[PDB]
Amino acid sequence: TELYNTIFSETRKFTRESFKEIEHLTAKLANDRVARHDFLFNNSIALISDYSGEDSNGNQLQATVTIPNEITNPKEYDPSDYPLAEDESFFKQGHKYDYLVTFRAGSLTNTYEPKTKMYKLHAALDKLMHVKQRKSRFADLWRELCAVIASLDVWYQTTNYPLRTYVKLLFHKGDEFPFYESPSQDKIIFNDKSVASILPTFVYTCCQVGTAIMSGILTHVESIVAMNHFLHCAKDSYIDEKLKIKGIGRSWYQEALHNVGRATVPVWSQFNEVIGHRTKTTSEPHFVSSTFISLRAKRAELLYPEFNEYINRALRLSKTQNDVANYYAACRAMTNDGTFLATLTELSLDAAVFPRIEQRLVTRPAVLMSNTRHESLKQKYANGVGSIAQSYLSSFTDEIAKRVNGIHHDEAWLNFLTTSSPGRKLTEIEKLEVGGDVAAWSNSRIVMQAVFAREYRTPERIFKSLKAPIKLVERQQSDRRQRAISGLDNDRLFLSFMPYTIGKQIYDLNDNAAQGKQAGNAFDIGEMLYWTSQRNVLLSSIDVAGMDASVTTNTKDIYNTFVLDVASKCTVPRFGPYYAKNMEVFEVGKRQSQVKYVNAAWQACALEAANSQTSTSYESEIFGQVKNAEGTYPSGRADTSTHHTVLLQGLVRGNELKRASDGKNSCLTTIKILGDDIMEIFQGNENDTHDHAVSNASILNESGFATTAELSQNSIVLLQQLVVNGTFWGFADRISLWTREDTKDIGRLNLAMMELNALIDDLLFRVRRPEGLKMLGFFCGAICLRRFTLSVDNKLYDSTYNNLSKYMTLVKYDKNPDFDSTLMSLILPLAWLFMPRGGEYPAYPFERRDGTFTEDESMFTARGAYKRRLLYDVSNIREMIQQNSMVLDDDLLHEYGFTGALLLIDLNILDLIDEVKKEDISPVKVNELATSLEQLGKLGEREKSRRAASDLKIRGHALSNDIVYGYGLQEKIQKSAMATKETTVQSKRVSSRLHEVIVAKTRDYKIPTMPADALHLYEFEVEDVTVDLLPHAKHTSYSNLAYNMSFGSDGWFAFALLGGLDRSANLLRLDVASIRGNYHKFSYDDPVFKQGYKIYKSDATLLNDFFVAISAGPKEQGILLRAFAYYSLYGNVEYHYVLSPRQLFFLSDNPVSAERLVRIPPSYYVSTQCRALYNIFSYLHILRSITSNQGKRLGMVLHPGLIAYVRG
Amino acid sequence: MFAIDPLKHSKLYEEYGLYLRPHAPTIRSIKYASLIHSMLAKHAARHNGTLINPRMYADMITLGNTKVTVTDIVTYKALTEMSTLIESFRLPSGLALIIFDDEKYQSLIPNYINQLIAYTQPHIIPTWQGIADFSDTYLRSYFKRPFELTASNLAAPQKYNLSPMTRSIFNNTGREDAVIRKLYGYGEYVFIRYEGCLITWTGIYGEVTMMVNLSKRDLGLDVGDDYLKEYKKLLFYGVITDAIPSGISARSTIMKISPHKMMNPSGGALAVLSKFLEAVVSTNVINATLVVYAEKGAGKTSFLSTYAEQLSLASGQVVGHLSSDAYGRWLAKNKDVEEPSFAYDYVLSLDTDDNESYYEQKASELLISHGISEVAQYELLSVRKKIKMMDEMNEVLIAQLENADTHSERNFYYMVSTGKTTPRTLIVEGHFNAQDATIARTDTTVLLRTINDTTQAMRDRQRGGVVQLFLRDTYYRLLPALHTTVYPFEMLESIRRWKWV
């Protein structure tokens, strides 16, 4: 009846009497909204006001549920909250609010005549209040709130916790919900006009606070403190007040860790290993303790005093480093909301992209050589910050020019368009006409390049592009402003391509950039983990506030000098429309004009540097066309990250050289830069490190930037990853399980489970209790993703319903008199969540026939084809190998409903969704566009591939066109081009072709078994021998290096059993990854390898034609021949598991690390690929079941059919 | 083989001073190149304006070493047709692709020739002042070679070995073409026709050459005339072809005037100016503004006033024009009033010459603090000594651009641009590129150059010329050429080329 009284809520296992009950109740929550209003607003829940309990570190705390009068009694709409200028050309200059002010939802009245400025303004404010607030990831917002509340009820087994009283006091207005959303109108329709305007965001706020409670980050009293602070921020304007105190509520942790005094922390090696632990001091130097006064005063005058009192409580009652970590994660949950921050871009445009000047003006380099238009070709700095950056950068120009000379730049431009263009899109579908006739409607850059390919070599294309405006497109991300990003056409993108190509080469010449390390695991933070285990070290996470708005035109000239130096030194003809030639030129000192030989790249770079226009133009519904002031940096450009990286590394390393030439030492060890993120590490005395850090700050101030100097002894930040004393403090409130950037229907819903599993795996080491997060994901799959509606034919209605209702539960409609083919509602069973190609979600214990249970699958269990082993684990696999059978117990698999899920994934019913239909161009036009596009760089590679593909075709071995290299560009143009500007939505239904297999596959439907899934039949017996732990198990028992890896936890014990991750410990690499995945990159389930192995088993004279048609190089040719040779011998067994680097973050990627834990009898080693296969068996079993692992040694037993399958 | 066919586009070559020799192996070669141009246009019209193998076409035409012969046929049909055409020429080598080094020539090259340039070493002919040198092999072999008549050269054509079928005539005698044609026996010859002028002046550092887009009759100047005589026509239509600083001054006289080819405007300049004119015309834009940067001393207000008048006449709208010292002459009056006025007529009334600027007062006090009072004192310093003072001038400049207060410059241009009675289209002048964050929101900012040695115009004037030269050098140190460079005749040609109504 109720979810906190089921037998699953008390046992957390699935019997046959408990799984059907959860299936029924989650179906009742997923189907109708009357039951959702009944569940969220039951009468039996008493409203609590005062409350008592523990904090995140176990100390008693008392809070009171408080809701201000401005939320229950909202003010009326004030039109001076969004003022205009006198001309009414744009909003007013200093305007207080950029986001949705809180008011009564019916108070906003568009009483103006149409085609008026006030009419446009109030229509846009209606769009702000009704459209910009619906941000839901999986389902409607009330279903997501039902998922959070259901998870909390089943976990805590009671219904009296304060978030229920918050939900009832904020959202119970009558006998219906106060608002709802419709995907047909794409807006939030209000039912109660008396409710507040910001009130539909608090459903998502309550979802995030419940996620934080499920995480173990917030307790219930801390959830009271969090919700009181969010309503206090919503008292006037919620997003503005959140952004105003976003840093004050976080930056106290340095003072807290100072007052801790001593910490026993782990010690990291150079080679990614925990080698010991030390006991260090955590007191701070005196220039850090001077900032504490300003932070205390600003904290006392700015923050809500309940949250301020919680922060002072965290300052006092912390004794370890883990105490400060727990209170810091609590304050991250208390200040961040999870929702993506979004309003009208006219409101955030003046704060995201408007240029600004800070500290001082940047002057110019002396122009040494000059064009006849007096435009600069060569220049040099007299003295100042340009001279300091160039003193370091000018030593790289000759090597970079040597590297640039060996690149074909036309093929590089075409590869840049096909792969990783910076805006990724033209932001809108545009009309494509050349000779007075339109060609296509498209938004891809490669179809745009294929259309205007006749003028790729024409110089007037560049000047034609200088006439076009630079487009503006907005962004969402949580805990951050709206961040308008620019978009520009292919020719303005082409002007910035050679500066990008030049500045890209310096990454291969230094070690002071961070591009090489984004792998999703603990290799990304290894240098911080090393340098924070050191002593006499000063850490500096120096932050430049608003860098793209701070780069002026003269600041761009600093990088332009470096680009012009490299461009003058190189020898590159034929870049674009440009070609190397003698050119009339001016020089300083020379009164007349000289003649110099100028190559193509230096022409392109000089013409780009001399014709600079940044200002983005936005097309507004209120004001028409809005332009920006100039002197920003466009950031939808080719060289956007490389510019800031090169400039910052030049300023820092040139300041090191400048201090050397002034007679001062350097204490700088490493720097890491990725554009607007600098990470400086100094080592030495406090005097020298303070002097060098102050000099770097002053030389950034001299370059025209404003800097906030957060510099510490024991904490470092880079790329939103915080390391404190050899320990990773993850940021769990940067991942939103509930909101999105864009509103988008799901349709496929296997993709929805893949997205949910990826987000759950991203929240895995940055969380404190992963088991409640597993329950939360189970309920958001059981409520949010459980509904499917499909249109079914009228004559075919009853025979479809009666056949499908034997295995599933289906909701049917009465009639359809007015139209044909009414739609049928079917809800999928909960067994679909745990299936191969279904949900692939970790499962709870299922009961066998004997009363034994399967294993509670942990957060480290593999996905992919390894989920099929649960079908055999439920079938009592130990009993099934002790009487030598392979019979799946289809009766028990039917009573849990696995066979309906497998019938559903077999019949492909969940593919029949609505589909946006594009109206394509003629295929003769497609061939013409691709043939014209091939003539732009590296002639002759694709027509040879087409010739060899036709040669394979005539000998009777046809290749598919998505594998042939001469094709595919045809396929890309065919996908992304249209002959019209509008698209239609086509729905799908069941017809006789699908009804025939509905009738055929639903008579008995035994679950099929292949001959190859005998490899699942293996088990592990527990011996009384206790394994030894790794020696770093004692070094991580003090001050855990993740929030889930505390002493005693399963992540800690998995690290203590399997060890850490290593890049050089590849014991078996070919034989493991062969039966798991690929050979090196070519997986066996690729059409490339499959068609190649077909032509390999056939005559070998056609093989070289296969190599020419794929057009692979000779090294890949040899690798792929060895791939066929390794598949032909010992390629029959294969196992296909899937893990993730965010999932196995600190843990090892190697299955060989489990061979010390499991005793395998030597009579099973009957093939050369048994060893790695059994290592994978042991490794996946040990990761799958860490929760019941008490440190005993395992013994593996195998099935005789498994031995017979591995022998042959 | 030229990039542009002379047998078809003969008038474009007549513009350059090049006349076809009348109708030998060169005579056969130019017809062969015409046939190749026609065949290339036919093959390019069938596949999206492109050629299917431009390296193959380039080898067949320029090297002449490739025969494609049918012994797919569909993929190589055009190459077989081009092969049978080039094979029948029976040339000992190929036809080299020939390009002039002019921008007006390069804009008129067809697309398929541009596709062939990337796979060919072309023969590039340099241009001195927009005129290709007539001593090249191809220009001597295909065209008539010009002969210049001057005041000392002048005689009957029988005195030299001149003939109508070989030479063309450049009349530089200062006399009428009819008088030379009937009085000295040049009746059967063809005269080359130029529409502009080239003037050589006397300079401070030497002599200065100036190209002017007016005729010698319209520009009423003779040898010996002063620089200030007919100054405004020179300013509106002239470009100095020398390095900066070119020592032109008010004391310059004319050494020589000859007829010369007219300059063609740049493509990027006309592009940015037509972007501004599109903003002026369109009804979707509420306010349109052109920011024009120039060096202090260029005479930019005198041009931009006439530019604003011509834009009002060709457009039909009211054009506002703030000077470059507008905020300075405002702040020299209103830096103490708590709520000062921002009305356009008041600020426009403060733009007169007899109002002192705020930055001029601060720079004059800064010069007095170093004992500088004279131009001879200021010129006698070293470069480091000057830069040490310009850093202090940048410190007094940064206080007015750093924030948005009521007397800030950003708020000044905000409250002028978004006023009630201010005109829709504004033209605002600036001194340096750091005002891009401060002048009102535009999409078109250009940089202006004139015929003015700015450091010579500043030392040849009164009312605190030391402060004027100091501010010129400070603003030069803050203003590179990082926006598109536009001359005055280009800004007039932009208005003349825009189709109105």
The answer to whether B406 contacts chain A (CB < 8 Å) is: no
B422 touches chain A (CB under 8 A): yes
Q: How far apart are CA B256 and CA B216, in angstroms?
A: 12
What is the rounded CA–CA span in Å between residue A1118 and residue A224?
Answer: 64
What is the distance between the alpha carbons of residues A966 and A947, in angstroms, rounded to a whole number? 9
Nearest-Cα residue of chain A relative to residue B383: A382
One-letter identity of residue A16: R
Contact B54, B115 (CB under 8 A): yes
Q: Does B472 carry a binding-site annotation?
A: no
Strand partners of residue A376:
A370
Q: Parallel, antiparallel, or unpaired for β A668-673 and A438-442?
A: unpaired
Report the DSSP pairing between strands B288-294 and B425-430. Answer: parallel
The token pair that represents A757 in the structure block: 């599993």
CB-based contacts of A9-17 (< 8 A; 24+ apart in sequence): A9/A153, A9/A154, A9/A155, A9/A157, A10/A157, A12/A844, A12/A845, A12/A856, A13/A844, A13/A845, A13/A846, A13/A847, A13/A853, A13/A856, A14/A844, A14/A845, A14/A846, A14/A847, A14/A896, A15/A847, A16/A847, A16/A895, A16/A896
Instruction: Select the residue of A93, A467, A939 nearest B53 (Cβ to Cβ).
Output: A939
Q: How far apart are CA A878 and CA A872, in angstroms?
A: 10
For testing contact with chain B, the best of A86, A349, A356, A363 (most B CBs within 10 A): A363
Helical packing angle, A220-233 and A321-335, nearest 10°:
40
Nearest to B287 among A89, A629, A928 (CB): A89
Burial bucket for residue A1119 (CB in 10 Å: 0-12, 13-18, 19+): middle
Is B268 part of the contact surface with chain A (CB cutoff 8 Å)? Answer: yes
**The amino acid at B312:** S
A1053 is written with which tokens?
């014990």
Q: Are A462 and A607 in contact (CB under 8 A)?
A: yes
B138 CB-contact burial (10 Å; exposed 0-12 / middle 13-18 / buried 19+): middle
Residue B124 to residue A553, Cβ atoms within 8 A: no
Contact (CB, 8 A) for B224 and B165:
no
CA dist A340 and A741 (Å) reads: 7
Helix axis angle for B300-315 and B267-281, nearest 10°, is 50
Distance CA A1118, CA A1104 (A): 12
Based on the number of CB atoms within 10 Å of its own CB, is A52 exposed (0-12), middle (13-18) or buried (19 or more)?
exposed
Give A-chain residues touching B344 at CB under 8 angstroms. Answer: none
A762 carries a ligand binding annotation: no
Its sign, for the CA torsion A1047, A1050, A1053, A1055, is: negative
H-type alpha helices, B45-157: 54-58, 77-87, 103-107, 111-117, 137-142
Under a CB-based contact definition with an 8 Å cutoff, are residues B194 and B17 in contact?
Answer: yes
> From A615, which residue of chain B is nearest by alpha-carbon distance?
B443
- Give how far B173 is from chain A: nearest CA, Å: 27
3-state secondary structure A833-846: HHCCCCCCCCCCCE
Residues facing residue A583 across a β-bridge: A596
B179/chain A closest Cα distance in angstroms: 37
Q: How many residue contacts between A and B have a Cβ separation below 8 Å?
A: 219
On chain A, the residues whose CB falls within 8 A of the CB of B278 are 467
Query: Which residues on adjacent β-strands are paired with residue A831?
Result: none
Which of B72, B436, B490, B494 is the mutation pick for testing A, counting most A CBs within 10 A? B436
- Beta strands at B425-430 and B319-322: parallel, antiparallel or unpaired: parallel
Q: Do A582 and B397 touch (CB under 8 A)?
A: no
CB of B107 within 8 Å of a chain A CB? The answer is yes
The answer to whether residues B405 and B411 touch, using CB atoms and an 8 Å cutoff, is yes
Contact (Cβ atoms closer than 8 angstroms) between residue A767 and residue A732: yes
Integer CA distances (angstroms), B173 to A832, B149, B168, in order: 98, 6, 15
**Torsion angle of C-alpha atoms B424, B429, B433, B437, degrees rounded to 10:** -30
The half-sphere exposure of B158 on its side-chain side, counting CA atoms within 13 A, is 3
A316 burial type by CB count under 10 A (0-12 exposed, 13-18 middle, 19+ buried): exposed
Question: Which chain A residue has the Cα nearest residue B482?
Answer: A610
Is B405 part of the contact surface with chain A (CB cutoff 8 Å)?
A: no
Q: How far apart are CA A657 and CA A780, in angstroms?
A: 57
The token duo for B65 is 């070493």
Strands of the sheet containing A537-540, edge to edge, are A668-673, A678-683, A537-540, A711-712
Chain A environment of B397 (Cβ under 8 Å): 361
Q: How far is it, in rounded angstroms, from Cα B435 to Cα B438?
A: 5
Cβ of B434 within 8 Å of Cβ of A361? The answer is yes
- Report how far residue A852's alpha carbon sits from residue A877's, in angstroms, rounded to the nearest whole number: 12
B436/A355 Cβ within 8 A: yes
Resolution of the experimental model, in Å, one decimal: 2.8
Q: Tell me the helix, strand and coil percentages in chain B, rounded to 5.
A: 40, 15, 45
Rounded to a whole number, what is the distance in angstroms from the first to the last CA of chain A? 54
A481 is in an annotated binding site: yes
A34, burial (CB in 10 Å: exposed 0-12, middle 13-18, buried 19+): exposed
DSSP category for residue B217:
T
Question: Residue A1066 and residue A1151: Cα distance in Å, rounded?
Answer: 10
Query: Could you say which of A454, A595, A629 has the minimum Cβ distance to residue B437?
Result: A629
Alpha-carbon torsion, ordered A692, A698, A700, A703, to 10 deg? -140
Q: Which of A28, A30, A20, A24 is nearest to A789 (CA)?
A: A30
Q: Which residue of B has its CA nearest to A630?
A: B436
Residue A327 to residue A302: CA distance in whole angstroms: 20
Nearest to A354 by CA among A434, A490, A472: A472
Residue A33 labelled as part of a binding site: yes
Interface test with A, best of B433, B447, B450 (most A CBs within 10 A): B433
Helix/strand/coil (H, E, C) string of A332-393? HHHHCCCCECCCCHHHHHHHHCCCCCCCCCCCCCEEEEECCCCCEEEEECCCCHHHHHHHHH
Q: Give A1018's strand partners.
A: A1198
Record: contact B286-A623, CB cut-off 8 A: yes
User: Alpha carbon of A815 to those of A184, A987, B493: distances in Å?
Assistant: 23, 20, 74
Partners of A985 in beta bridges = A916
Instruction: Collect all residues of chain A within an 8 Å Cβ-Cβ radius of residue B477.
Output: 363-364
Amino acid A247 reads: G
CA distance A1000 to A907: 11
What are the chain B neighbours of A435 within 8 Å (beta carbons)?
49
Separation in Å, CA B276 to CA B290, B309, B446: 7, 16, 10
Q: Which amino acid is at A1022?
A: V
Residues 6 or more apart in contact with residue B88 via CB below 8 angstroms: none
Rounded CA-CA distance B85/B68 in Å is 11
- Which residue, A608, A583, A577, A615, is CA-closest to A597? A583
Buried b (16+ CB within 10 A) or exposed e, A187-199: bbebeeeebbbbb
CA distance A767 to A1140: 17
For A1101-1157, give the secondary structure using H, E and C. CCHHHHHHHHCCCHHHHHHHHHHHHHHHCCCCCCCCEECCCCCCCCECCCHHHHCCC
Looking up tokens 């263009």 gives A421
Please state, in angstroms and rounded to a whole number, the distance separating the CA atoms of residues B276 and B304: 15
State how far the Cα of A899 lies from the Cα of A889, in Å rounded to an integer.
Answer: 11
How many alpha carbons fall within 13 Å on the CB side of residue A1157?
A: 28
Nearest Cα residue to A85 out of A126, A121, A113 = A121
Helices (H), A570-619: 600-610
The angle at the Cα of B404, spanning B403 to B405, to the nearest 5 degrees, equals 105
Q: Which chain B positions have a beta carbon within 8 Å of A564's beta carbon?
A: none
CA-wise closest residue to A373 among B449, B416, B140: B449
Question: Hey, is A551 helix, strand or coil?
Answer: coil
In this structure, the number of other CB atoms found within 10 A of the CB of residue A363 comes to 26
DSSP state of A457: T
Task: Report the chain A residue with the minimal C-alpha distance to residue B438.
Answer: A629
Strand partners, B226: B253
Longest CA span, chain A = 102
- Please check whether residue A875 is in contact with residue A883, taking contact to mean a CB–CB distance below 8 angstroms: no
Pairing label, strands A470-473, A616-620: parallel
| Residue given tokens 């007052």 in the structure block | A259
Q: Coil, strand, or helix at residue B211?
A: strand
* B482/A553 CB distance under 8 A: yes
Instruction: Sort out which chain B residues have CB atoms less than 8 A from A364's CB and list them.
Output: 477-480
* DSSP per-residue string spanning A740-752: -SS-----SSHHH
Positive/negative CA dihedral, A391, A394, A399, A400? positive
Instruction: Specify whether the CB–CB gap between A529 and A722 falls below 8 A.
Output: no
Query: Measured in whole angstroms, how far is the alpha carbon of residue A377 from the centre of its chain?
Result: 42
Picking from B48, B118, B284, the nearest residue to A932 by CB comes out as B48
Per DSSP, the three-state class of B92 is coil
Closest CA to B401 of B347, B429, B437: B437
Q: Is B8 within any annotated ligand binding site?
A: no
Q: Are A989 and A790 in contact (CB under 8 A)?
A: yes
Give me A7's structure tokens: 């037998």
User: Which residues from B are below 8 Å from A628, CB to CB?
Assistant: 441
Cβ–Cβ of B436/A459 closer than 8 Å? no
Quick one: which of A214, A251, A252, A208 has its CA closest to A229?
Answer: A208
Nearest-angstrom CA–CA distance, B49 and B56 = 17
SS3 (DSSP) at A511: coil
| Nearest-CB residue to A625 (from B48, B285, B437) | B285
Question: A820 among the known binding-site residues?
Answer: no
Q: Answer whether A318's CB lies under 8 Å from A324's CB.
A: yes
Distances (CA, A) of A183 to A342, A671, A780, B58: 19, 49, 20, 59
Question: Any binding-site annotation on A410?
Answer: no
A12: tokens are 């957390």
Pairing of strands B167-171, B145-149: parallel
Tokens representing A145? 């709130």
Alpha-carbon gap, residue B14 to A25, rounded angstroms: 91
CA dist list (Å): A651 to A46, A258, A646, A1066, A1080: 63, 32, 9, 40, 41
Q: Given the DSSP bridges, would you call strands B425-430 and B254-260 parallel, antiparallel or unpaired?
A: unpaired
DSSP β-ladder status, A716-718 and A721-723 = antiparallel
How far, CA to CA in Å, does A485 sit from each of A116, A188, A443, A470, A473? 29, 27, 17, 10, 5
- H-type helices in A1005-1069, by residue range? 1050-1058
Q: Least CB-CB distance to B50: which of A372, A582, A932?
A: A932
CA separation for the pair A511, A673 (Å, rounded): 10
Task: Say whether the peptide bond before residue B245 is cis (omega within 30 degrees of 0).
Answer: yes
Q: Is A285 exposed, middle or buried (0-12, 13-18, 19+ CB in 10 A)?
A: middle
The SS3 of residue A542 is coil
Distance between CA B424 and CA B317 in Å, rounded? 8
Tell me which of B50, B285, B405, B432 to substitute to probe the interface with A (most A C-beta atoms closer than 10 Å): B50
A745 labeled binding residue: no
Residue with tokens 């009666």: A802
B266 and A CB contact within 8 Å: yes
B300 marked as binding residue: yes
How far is it, in rounded angstroms, from Cα B487 to Cα B201? 20
Angle in degrees, 0-180, between the axes of helices B409-417 and B326-334, rounded to the nearest 10: 110
Sign of CA dihedral A785, A786, A791, A793: positive
Compare all CA atoms of chain A with the CA of B394 and give the residue at the minimum distance.
A361
Q: CA of A612: which chain B residue's CA is closest?
A: B483
With H, G, I as helix, E, B as strand and everything else as coil, classify residue A656.
Answer: helix
Chain-centroid distance of CA A1150 in Å reads 25
* Distance, CA of A492 to CA of B275 (rounded, Å): 15
Determine the Cα–Cα distance for residues B380 and A805; give it in Å rounded to an integer.
101
Contact B111 A458 (CB under 8 A): yes
Whether the Cβ atoms of residue B115 and residue B91 lie closer than 8 Å to each other: no
Which of A454, A467, A469 is nearest residue B48 as measured by Cβ atoms? A454
